[PDB]
Design a binder for these strands. Structure first.
Ligand SMILES: [Mg+2]
Ligand SMILES: [Mg+2]
Ligand SMILES: [Mg+2]
Ligand SMILES: [Mg+2]
Ligand SMILES: [Mg+2]
Ligand SMILES: [Mg+2]
Ligand SMILES: [Mg+2]
Ligand SMILES: [Mg+2]
Ligand SMILES: [Mg+2]
Ligand SMILES: [Mg+2]
Ligand SMILES: [Mg+2]
Ligand SMILES: [Mg+2]
Ligand SMILES: [Mg+2]
Ligand SMILES: [Mg+2]
Ligand SMILES: [Mg+2]
Ligand SMILES: [Mg+2]
Ligand SMILES: [Zn+2]
Lengths: 130, 171, 66, 174, 66, 37, 141
RNA sequence: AAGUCUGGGCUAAGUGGUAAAGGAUGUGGCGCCGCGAAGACAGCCAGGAGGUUGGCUUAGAAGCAGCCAUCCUUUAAAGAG
């Protein structure tokens, strides 16, 4: 009860490797536009971290049971969580927030972000890479 | 590995009465004792379906006592396919004849071709001391066409053990 | 008959029995002599007369070029 | 998993009055009485009607779901109202309004004329779409059905009266 | 996988792949194939890109020498 | 309508219904309709 | 279909179907069984009808055990004759089966396959049956 | 002739008040697994994509005629269907 917990550790392990893991609503795109953001947040940082896409249920257990502020930006709605500090992001949120706010109607909008450890904000996070 | 099962005493209670009330009449014995008992049917089944006549069941008697036993015999009601009575053999330190599982550590060359490996022995009879009772007995089965086979004479036989069958016996 | 690049034209009863018409390319009609006896158990027949030529699909039209 | 316990929104301004074994739902578009088991409690709360049942026995569960929907349908009925659209398909087939009445030409010798029951309005926006509309939902569903039966969709051709959104499934002719 | 024909001893596969081998290739000769069609695929590796060609290997009947 | 003593689902779209004291199978596919009898 | 290679006697008294099985009441070979729920004379043709159905469902694969044998000769007088003038002629062989008897067993075959195949086999038999799987209880026997 | 007697329960067929293999979301009651507030089951808004028409075949069979093979990839996920 269940293999949802060999996924709690995944996003607890690879969230225990950050301080600036931001979160966005990665859904509405096809499979072309999927590998878009995917290889382009893999090419705007290090490693292979765009988002990890994992349950809003589990990810709020991880952000709660590792203290990490409880990134209460907006856990509701589709949530993929752009692990921006498992890469090397900075103004690479521009490399995302613009490539999404280009292809299709509102491609990959954001909702949560921790700045080093302190909470960022909504549109104060799209403007934090402009 | 070792299982517990609560057991109770009976005297004059009719088996059909016991059996009616979810209890399995039965008996425990060994060279030293012989006692009429009964265990709860559903509790026993849970256990026996793991134990079988292989592993040691231990009986928590009402008096506090705790006998380490093997199942020796289970009578079925032919018509209904259900246990009507059990024979519990109370283990001491003396050697004891018993049945020990065979696990066929391997995959067949005769199967995977166009075959079906009937394994005639799920286990094997074995003289052994109760403090030395195995779980497995391992069987090498790399090569076995349709149809070659082995005869238990070619069995690993742990320390403590002693085949209790004619080694001309097919497995 | 549609496995031999054929186009059905129609079917009418006969001696009961029953007949079928189709435009099958001759180039797919060798086996049909025996292939017919094989499906109707030596009870069906055929006739075969030329009608017209036409442009084969470009798959053979550029494969027969060899 | 439940329809009986679902609360029924009630628009400003439709009025649900309750009596024994009947609820009267009145709204902008008219009124309907809704018969109801003597065994369910219909409950009027604020801008909402609930239905309650006195047990978890089978017959009661059944009437529950049924009863809320019966009322929910009357509620919708007198505000939004209901309609259904039939599409007429096929080369010679056309619909027309003759006064209040609907005339179907659908390949018979005669034409078929259909009078609307009281509480039912027919529209023909084009000659190949008919629209049945009214407050009573099952009445609408029924008139719509009746109409369709005059010339049911063919099995082999896109031909006959069709429910809007009814898929055209066809088998091969010959 | 057009290229795998000009490197194993084959014009066609092996009829029933798996048990029957009609040619072979090494762990280095799967990586070279993994090279030419590496700008085509998806993953941008060579330990990943080659297991895609170590699988079009039994998609015909050629073992990969290891 | 098939009418038999054995009415069964014939395919995963088939549906066993009971109306007015009789068991029917009902389905997308009209061949699958059955009534017991 | 089965019958004795030879009999010490050609014809035999009908006898009686009382009782649960004398024996054969537990699985002894395969993994799955089919047990009789009622007493009956199962006939050689019936048994084979069951055998064959099983083999067809396995597409030759698997192993099947038949644990009853038709050793009892079934007699019948010619059509339309009267009573008397002696016992009729042997017209075939049956196996006497009483409830609890395991009649067939299957081995080396998936659980779904033993299931269907035993189900079907049943349908060829003129009695109620239940399918069973090997247990502790059979190994204890 | 004598209880429209008392208490618990079931049945909705007039079963009771004519029968079998067999069939069945009839009903009520047990038992045992599986999933579930780390959000299940039911609906519904996404996505279900790459190497790739997989190879061999056939006139063309490109996930889906048919023999075979059934690996890996980016993945939350996606069958050489
Ligand atoms: Mg059992
Ligand atoms: Mg039991
Ligand atoms: Mg209404
Ligand atoms: Mg009608
Ligand atoms: Mg349906
Ligand atoms: Mg007699
Ligand atoms: Mg015996
Ligand atoms: Mg007979
Ligand atoms: Mg004679
Ligand atoms: Mg006779
Ligand atoms: Mg039967
Ligand atoms: Mg009187
Ligand atoms: Mg009374
Ligand atoms: Mg009656
Ligand atoms: Mg009657
Ligand atoms: Mg029942
Ligand atoms: Zn169906």
């Amino acid at each position: 009860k269940r293999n949802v917990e060999l996924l709690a550790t995944l996003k607890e392990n690879l969230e225990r490797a950050q301080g600036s893991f931001f979160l966005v609503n990665y859904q509405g795109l096809p499979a072309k536009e999927t590998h878009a953001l995917r290889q382009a947040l893999k090419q705007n940082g290090a490693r292979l971290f765009v988002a990890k896409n994992t349950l809003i249920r589990l990810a709020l257990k991880e952000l709660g049971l590792p203290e990490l502020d409880g990134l209460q930006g907006p856990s509701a709605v589709v949530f993929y969580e752009d692990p921006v500090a498992a890469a090397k992001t900075l103004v690479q949120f521009a490399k995302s927030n613009p490539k999404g706010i280009p292809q299709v109607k509102s491609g990959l909008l954001q909702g949560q972000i921790l700045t080093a450890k302190d909470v960022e904000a909504l549109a104060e996070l799209p403007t934090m890479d402009e | 590995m070792e299982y517990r099962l609560k057991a109770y005493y009976r005297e004059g209670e009719k088996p059909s009465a016991l059996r009616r009330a979810g209890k399995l009449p039965g008996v425990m014995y060994n060279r030293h004792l012989n006692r009429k008992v009964y265990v709860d049917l559903v509790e026993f089944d849970k256990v026996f379906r793991q134990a079988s006549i292989h592993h040691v069941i231990v009986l928590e008697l009402p008096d506090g006592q705790s006998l380490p036993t093997l199942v020796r015999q289970v009578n079925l009601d032919k018509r209904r396919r259900r246990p009507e009575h059990v024979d519990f053999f109370v283990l001491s330190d003396e050697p004891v004849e018993m049945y020990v599982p065979l696990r066929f550590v391997g995959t067949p060359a005769g199967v995977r071709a166009g075959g079906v490996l009937q394994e005639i022995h799920r286990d094997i009879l074995v003289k052994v001391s109760p403090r030395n009772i195995p779980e497995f007995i391992e069987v090498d089965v790399s090569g076995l066409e349709i149809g070659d086979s082995l005869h238990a004479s070619d069995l690993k036989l742990p320390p403590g053990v002693e085949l209790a069958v004619s080694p001309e016996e097919t497995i | 008959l549609n496995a031999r690049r054929g186009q059905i034209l129609g079917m009418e009863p006969r001696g009961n029995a029953q007949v079928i018409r189709a435009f099958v390319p001759l180039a797919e009609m060798f086996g049909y002599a025996t292939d017919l006896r094989s499906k109707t158990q030596g009870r069906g027949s055929f006739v075969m007369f030329f009608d017209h030529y036409q442009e084969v699909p470009k798959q053979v039209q550029e494969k027969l070029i060899k | 998993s439940r329809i009986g316990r679902l609360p029924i929104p009630v628009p400003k301004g439709v009025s649900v009055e309750v009596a024994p074994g009947r609820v009267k739902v009145k709204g902008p578009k008219g009124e309907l009485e809704v018969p109801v088991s003597p065994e369910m409690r219909v409950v009027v709360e604020e801008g909402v009607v609930r239905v309650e049942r006195p047990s978890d026995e089978r017959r009661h569960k059944s009437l529950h779901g049924l009863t809320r929907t019966l009322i929910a349908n009357a509620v919708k009925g007198v505000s939004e109202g209901y309609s259904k659209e039939l599409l007429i398909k096929g080369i010679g087939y056309r619909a027309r309004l003759v006064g209040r009445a609907l005339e179907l030409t659908v390949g018979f010798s005669h034409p078929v004329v259909v009078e609307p029951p009281e509480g039912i309005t027919f529209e023909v926006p084009e000659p190949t779409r008919v629209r049945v509309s009214g407050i009573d939902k099952q009445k609408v569903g029924q008139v719509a059905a009746n109409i369709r039966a005059i010339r049911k969709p063919s099995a082999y051709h896109e031909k006959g009266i069709y429910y809007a959104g009814e898929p055209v499934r066809l088998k091969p002719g010959k | 996988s057009y290229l795998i024909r000009k490197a194993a001893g084959l014009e066609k596969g092996a009829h029933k792949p798996g048990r029957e081998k009609v040619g072979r290739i090494t762990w280095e000769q799967v990586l070279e194939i993994a090279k030419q069609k590496m700008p085509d695929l998806n993953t941008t590796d060579l330990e990943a890109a080659a297991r895609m060609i170590a699988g079009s290997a039994r998609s015909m009947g050629v073992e990969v020498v290891g | 309508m098939k009418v038999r003593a054995s009415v069964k689902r014939i395919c995963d779209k088939c549906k066993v219904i009971r109306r007015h004291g009789r068991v029917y199978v009902i389905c997308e596919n009209p061949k699958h309709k059955q009534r017991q009898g | 279909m089965l019958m004795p290679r030879r009999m010490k006697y050609r014809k035999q008294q009908r006898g009686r179907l009382k009782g649960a099985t004398k024996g054969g009441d537990y699985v002894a070979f395969g993994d799955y069984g089919l047990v009789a729920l009622e007493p009956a004379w199962i006939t050689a043709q019936q048994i084979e009808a069951a055998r064959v159905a099983m083999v067809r469902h396995f597409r030759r694969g698997g192993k099947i055990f038949i644990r009853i044998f038709p050793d009892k000769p079934y007699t019948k007088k010619p059509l339309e004759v009267r009573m008397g003038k002696g016992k009729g002629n042997v017209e075939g062989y049956v196996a006497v089966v009483k409830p609890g008897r395991v009649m067939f067993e299957v081995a080396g075959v998936t659980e779904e396959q033993a299931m269907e195949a035993l189900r079907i086999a049943g349908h060829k038999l003129p009695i109620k049956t239940k399918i069973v799987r090997r247990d502790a209880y059979d190994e204890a026997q």
